Symmetry: D2
């Protein structure tokens, strides 16, 4: 009824045309979305090997959906011990790193989940088409996540910006809702698991104290922490605030994996105007060593992160 019905493909296709493309991006994202519709539905009536299962089901629906587009060539998941090289007949120019169901086993309490993804391009003659083509996050060409909450959103970041598409469940199509979004300069909210982290935090500790009982003319920051990277980062895009998970134990700290949680998220944030830092290191410019390596991340509104860095500079 919406008849200049901007679907994702519609969008992704007219951007390709401008790049003097070949199609693979569009075929790919098309393939990506069918895994996302089926995953959205798997979840929307979930609770109707054995224990783990859902993340797996999804993992295997994203690998098989991405192989069939003749667009991918190396694929990396939380779930697989090492990269999977797409067979020669179905290869294409793209490298996809993704987390098929972040939050996965913690959805009984109906918490908003997600699939997160980063897309690279193979630039090399051949190696053949190897895992070593796992390189710094500022080389990403597309990145984003699919959120599964009250409604299902595919937030997508590319060279030209960040766009928000929501699944219309009545036509099984992702339609452009929010367009070319930017993040608020600063904003009333901070997010960090304030338990344990408090006994183990760095200069975070002070920024937190500062955001609770402020010194200069203020009113305190509201705290919020869902416990799903996709739920706490998307809110941060939507309202403006800060998100951080550095937690010191594990020193390749974090818990969140660089290639597929941190670098899509950071790419989005930066493309919408936020900054994402390790505190000392800037996350999209860290160059990886392992496909499964772990990174500290802090992301959100520019001003607020600037704030934690200025604290961090005159500390250790």
């Amino acid at each position: 009824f919406d008849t200049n019905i901007v679907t994702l493909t519609r969008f992704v296709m007219e951007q390709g045309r401008k790049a003097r493309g070949t199609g693979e991006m569009t075929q790919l994202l098309n393939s990506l979305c069918t895994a996302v519709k089926a995953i959205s539905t798997a979840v929307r009536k979930a609770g109707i090997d054995q224990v783990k299962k859902l993340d797996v089901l999804s993992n295997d629906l994203v690998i098989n959906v991405l192989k069939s587009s003749f667009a991918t060539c190396v694929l990396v998941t939380e779930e697989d011990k090492n990269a999977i090289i797409v067979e020669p007949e179905k290869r294409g120019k793209y490298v996809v790193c993704f987390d098929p169901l972040d939050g996965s086993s913690n959805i009984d309490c109906l918490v908003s989940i997600g699939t997160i993804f980063g897309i690279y391009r193979k630039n090399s003659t051949d190696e053949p088409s190897e895992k070593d083509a796992l390189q710094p996050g500022r080389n990403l060409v597309a990145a984003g996540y699919a959120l599964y909450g009250s409604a299902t959103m595919l937030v997508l970041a590319m060279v030209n910006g960040v766009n928000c598409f929501m699944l219309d469940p009545a036509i099984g199509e992702f339609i452009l809702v929010d367009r070319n979004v930017k993040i608020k300069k600063k904003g009333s909210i901070y997010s960090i698991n304030e338990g344990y982290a408090k006994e183990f935090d760095p200069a975070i500790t002070e920024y937190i104290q500062r955001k609770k009982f402020p010194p200069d003319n203020s009113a305190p920051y509201g705290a919020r922490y869902v416990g799903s990277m996709v739920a706490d980062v998307h809110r941060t895009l939507v309202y403006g605030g800060i998100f951080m998970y550095p937690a010191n134990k594990k020193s390749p700290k974090g818990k969140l994996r660089l290639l597929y949680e941190c670098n899509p998220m950071a790419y989005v944030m930066e493309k919408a105007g936020g900054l994402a830092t390790t505190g000392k290191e800037a996350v999209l410019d860290i160059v990886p060593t392992d496909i499964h390596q772990r990174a500290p991340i802090i992301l959100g509104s520019p001003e607020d992160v600037t704030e934690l860095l200025e604290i961090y500079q005159k500390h250790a």
Copy 2:
């Protein structure tokens, strides 16, 4: 859960690859399906300018959906007085003739309806990209219909055969149900509006008498006539029988338009092994004069139509 999930695009894409393609077919059919999901839904809760409206809504959703694929160039509908030439920036190599909602105003009685389509290719340098590129139905490269009944089916015929895909409404995807289908040689059923036609029929009259009270060792044909070309032809593909609408008044007889009802349907039938005849003329090889011209059609199981022709030969 189905994970070698054969969607339409999946299918249409691996066939293109073999043809050493360019993409437009797939982009197109992709565009076609989004109009079909939205039309399926418009109908599935219909009854919840003014009087006519639905066929129109659909017409305008199929034109706008086909223009956005950079694949079409001339488009022809029941609804539009004359062809629409796709604007230069959005053009592609294909010509689509289609009936956006055959049956349209007769759906209050919840009768199964459909959108029917034929796809041509422009072979000419330029004319520019004109309506005259409306040529004989055996030149079609793709043809088929979307049925809207108990469930929603996109039956699609191409050079390699006829395939059946059903809409899974839980993932808004058309999935391959029935594959590479052929029609039964002969079969117990005939379809013709047996009212009026009886006071106005040709050698039909006798074939009908013959199918009611048979002479040689038989048992009578069951009659069935829904009154939607898509409903009565799809059953005919599915069970095997004969369908005919010649009705003599209008002598460019028929009522069904050649370019978009008769030639998709005939193409499907023939591609699945049936034959479709004007009785005297063979329908896909009739060459058109008008985009909106009318043709007599008889279609279905080979043997049964052969039967009406052999009657028709030794008559007028």
Copy 3:
């Protein structure tokens, strides 16, 4: 997002509060709506050793829901031989006759099919309940059918007249689509299987002659037979016309059973100002000797059923 939807459940309740007591009809119909829903989505996906199956599972379904509305005592199927008698702690005052999936034998062509149901009130006391309480004629409390077509339509024929509901596929409800339907006095369509009936047809033959060949300047009646009773009765309830089943070699010349098929439909047509005759008697007045008792049904717009019966007086 439009705040006052007239669910079947509301409507039944507001007509029924204005009666009250243990007028269990509402939790009876409310449970009927849950299996009819359940069936509809099953049928809209059946496609995505068995000579019969989806229909025996519908059978199972209907029985279970009927029984758990502590509203029932004797149930009647096409499949189950014997009348099924509900057990003590789930008993309530009604007897319900139903055909769980008319046309399950034509799903393959996606025709149009439905659930027929006739409710009765257990009259004679503590029998406990076994078949006496089930064999009235014109004593139906409320009857009607579910049509699973383009959309799922539930027509309820009550004491007060006939209304139609639609399954709002989006909210999970049968919303009121027409409030007090009444048939066209004479229609323009005749529904009969003129194949293997034409030779075996009795008096009715003069009748079809006069419907095709018009004995004046009158314009001939249009043939229309979908071949699924839910489909032909409902179309005849909306565009008028005559529908008939006079089968001869199905010898109480009807294939159609009284308790489940014929009786619910004749109670709908009659509560909407239409006629249903056996051709000798009125179908509503026949007395049941056995549950699965076949019979003939001629039902339609009034002045047409009459036009046939005065032929039938003349005739035999």
Copy 4:
């Protein structure tokens, strides 16, 4: 296609037949399920001058359905000032307290939100009914909430205990997912807004210290606050833990209202073996002076609420 689904409606009825009379709860809850459904699909598409809106239309919706189950007499909203008194010919025995859309003010980030509802039985007679009949404490007949998250979960807290239902998005029903849930005796999570509460927090401050900083070798409690009450109470019902609202500068230090927010949740936690204290008294035992009476709620797994209260005895 799996034949015996335990709809909320069946369950309520089978526990309730085993009570009987005018135990109207079933057409009351049955009508509650239709607006909760209706809301869910609205919220799953709100995205595809207004400082407030979807929630005033939910308000309108709930009121209308409540009233048409001829089951109600006094309704209580967050939006409407006064208790709304049902009119004579639609009156039935119950008083229902509800918050139509907790978190409507966070939809934009797709958090998780819900409908809270508390039912009461109009006690003192023919008042007619206006607010006396509405202000009990621990006298709730049944209460509970709708969580619109990944999926829509309806938790019903009854006399017999707590069970959870899921909206089967495909058949239009709340199917039984867990039959008699009881909380973990002590959880491992604490839910509180430590931002603009930390400085204003009273005794509760020692409590959060001892939940972060563990005074032994004990492992610290993990922070978790989604910031939408439906979301934090339900997660605390499944992984255990303490949830709290002690607001100080929201001065009966709680933002949360008793009749609609606090009371339904404390009746669920308690019927599932969990505690809800005001910190001085038990929240269930406070007496209502006005309908929109704010209050504090600490609710959780038993041995944790206790661990806080013995601090509170010590404290003040």
